[PDB]
């Protein structure tokens, strides 16, 4: 993961965030779109690898530069 650092794979979504955040982005993209954090001033879904905010993960998938159809 470009973001979290939970090893990722290239695949169809290109941008190699972990498999989950990709499929996630996908279903997100699709239904639950825009995940605007806990707006808790740039929440970390990283370093320690704890999901302090699921919303924030999508936000940083963007930030990482992860978009659905292989950005």
Contact residues: Zn ion, CB under 5 A: 1, 4, 6, 17-18, 21, 37-38, 43, 53, 56
CB 49 to Zn ion: min, Å? 9
* Distance in Å, CB of 68 to Zn ion, minimum: 15
Kindly tell me which of 18 and 28 has the beta carbon lying closer to Zn ion.
18
DSSP state of 2: -
- Closest to Zn ion by CB, 8 vs 30, is 8
CA distance 6 to 34: 22
**Sequence-separated (6 or more) residues with CB below 8 Å from residue 33:** none
> What is the smallest separation between the CB atom of 69 and Zn ion, expressed in angstroms?
18
| Cα-trace Rg, the chain | 11
């Amino acid at each position: 993961c470009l973001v979290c650092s939970d090893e990722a794979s290239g695949c169809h979504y290109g941008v190699l965030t972990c498999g989950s955040c990709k499929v996630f982005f996908k279903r997100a993209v699709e239904g639950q779109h825009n995940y605007l954090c806990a707006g808790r001033n740039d929440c970390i879904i990283d370093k320690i690898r704890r999901k302090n905010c699921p919303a924030c993960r999508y936000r940083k998938c963007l930030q990482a530069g992860m978009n659905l159809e292989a950005r």
